[PDB]
Structure 1
């Protein structure tokens, strides 16, 4: 199979297409990605017949910024007989994957597909039963086996395929479903919560987002991101000339430092986490993040970079390369990952973890 579908934010198809072409090419997995503006997905079509499976095995999904999710697919099923949409799907998947561990019947995240999304929910159980009967799905679900995807691009038109659960998004449509807590002081809180879900494996939260850790939130006012750190029972320095929500102060976990986030330097505590969601130019933010890493002021950081109006994949790649150049110059080893989260708009969220053994 030679096609790989990538789900993206509608309007970001050129970024997602350039990026997958670039990073697959770098691994000598050559192909082309046509763009349908505002479709909310891109198809990367490999020149070689079975390179689609190779690509979703060998390229780490975590290294893709503009893809919410991906999966390899066969040919487009275009005329699904309304009297039996199931048989052709089963037919297309039979002999392609067996004993899959989970089924996800998905759509692109656009306005036009909302009715189609409800169809997919209705279709899921009947399709699951048929795929289990055919041996395409295992009789018992399991996270270790491949995830089977059936992707409807319009009524009666879908692709079918799979992704590997150790190299994909674990979320339906690549969208973690979060509820805004009425007591948080800003909806920006959902970005950082989504970041924790997307970047830190759930079974590592208690160790890496740990009770008792010290964290610094730069440009914190009024406290959306601080709220998430407090929820993890961290002790937090919220740094801003603006005041923090009284509800956060009342927790007894937060010290408000009335300073500029760019000027603040930590002295005193062992800071594990720093986070930064600021309305500033991304080269400027990236420079401050690199300084925090190379000065050893944090072990991990999550921060947002604003995208410019044009050359958005390039700009954000250059910001990341700057941070990597700083790391390399100082001999610091770290893992960097970045993603246009669901709750991001014209920005990307980045996670950097120093490797200290």
Structure 2
């Protein structure tokens, strides 16, 4: 199989396609991706017939900025008959995947596929039973076996394939299922919450997003990001000229520092987390983040970078390169990930974890 589907935000197919062509090309996994504007997915078609599997094994999924999820697929099934929906799909997967671990029947994240999405979510149940009977899925769900994907691009038209559970998104359509809490002071809270899910493995939350950690929230007003930190039972310095929501102040976990987040300097030396959702030029945000990391003012950070109008993949890769240049100059070891989150529009969210020897 040579085709790899990557799910993306509709309207970002060109970025998604440019990035995968670049990073696959770096590994001599040559191929091309067409770009259907607003389709909400990209298919990278490898030149070599089994490079699809090689790509999704060897290229780290965490290194892709503009893909929410990916999976390798076979040929397109068209005209699935309503009286015969099971056999053609079983036939596509037989001998492609055996004893797979989980089934996801997904669509592109467009308004047009909204009715198709409801069909897919329901079709999952009887299809899962049939694939289990056919031996394509293990009778019991297993986290370490591959995820089987059935991907509907239109009614009666689907791809079938898989992804490896240690090199993919753990979430349906690459989108963590989140409900906005009514007592949160802003909807932006979902950006940070989704970031925690995307960037920090679930079995590491209690250790890395820990009760009692100190955090700093730059440009915090009125408190959407501070809210997520408070819910992890952290103590937060919320830094802004604007006021913090009273609901947060009443928890007794929040200290409001009335300052510009760009000018703020911590005196406290045991800050675990710094987060930043400040609307400013990405080159300038990136420099502030690099200051915090190089000076060891925080151990981990999550922050947003606004995308420009054009050359978005190039420019955000350059922002990231600036931060890396600063880290290298000072011999600092850190892991950087970035992802255009579901709750991100014309921006990407970055996570950096700094290491001390």
**Paired residue secondary structure (1:6):** strand
Cα offset for 1:127? Answer: 1.0
Q: Distance in 2 between matches of 1:154 and 1:267?
A: 56
Q: Distance in 2 between matches of 1:249 and 1:180?
A: 20
Unaligned runs of 5+ residues in structure 1 are none
Alignment size in residue pairs: 357
Q: Which moved more, 1:261-270 or 1:142-151?
A: 261-270
Ranges of 4+ aligned residues in structure 1 off by more than 4 Å: none
Contact 2:11/2:38 (<8 A) preserved: yes
Cα offset for 1:28? Answer: 1.1
Structural RMSD (CA): 0.8
- How high is the TM-score relative to the length of structure 2? 0.99
Contact 2:107/2:117 (<8 A) preserved: yes
1:269/1:248 CA distance change after superposition, 3 Å: farther
Partner of 2:258: 258
Q: Distance in 1 between matches of 2:289 and 2:353?
A: 12
Q: Distance in 1 between matches of 2:204 and 2:134?
A: 36
Contact 1:222/1:243 (<8 A) preserved: yes
Q: Distance in 2 between matches of 1:262 and 1:93?
A: 53
Q: Distance in 2 between matches of 1:178 and 1:123?
A: 22
Q: Which moved more, 1:74-83 or 1:87-96?
A: 74-83
Q: Distance in 2 between matches of 1:95 and 1:87?
A: 14
Contact 1:103/1:128 (<8 A) preserved: yes
For residues 34-54 of structure 1, give each alpha carbon's deviation from its aligned partner in whole angstroms, at most 9, with x where no partner exists: 000000000000000100000
Cα offset for 1:79? Answer: 2.2
Cα offset for 1:188? Answer: 0.4
Q: Which moved more, 1:324-333 or 1:75-84?
A: 75-84
Unaligned runs of 5+ residues in structure 2 are none
Cα offset for 1:269? Answer: 4.2
Cα offset for 1:84? Answer: 0.6
Cα offset for 1:171? Answer: 0.6
- How high is the TM-score relative to the length of structure 1? 0.99
Contact 2:269/2:297 (<8 A) preserved: no
Partner of 1:6: 6
Contact 2:107/2:116 (<8 A) preserved: yes
For residues 139-189 of structure 1, give each alpha carbon's deviation from its aligned partner in whole angstroms, at most 9, with x where no partner exists: 100101000000000011100000001111111101111111111111100
For residues 232-271 of structure 1, give each alpha carbon's deviation from its aligned partner in whole angstroms, at most 9, with x where no partner exists: 1111111111111111111111111111111111113411
Q: Distance in 2 between matches of 1:116 and 1:127?
A: 15
Contact 1:214/1:269 (<8 A) preserved: no
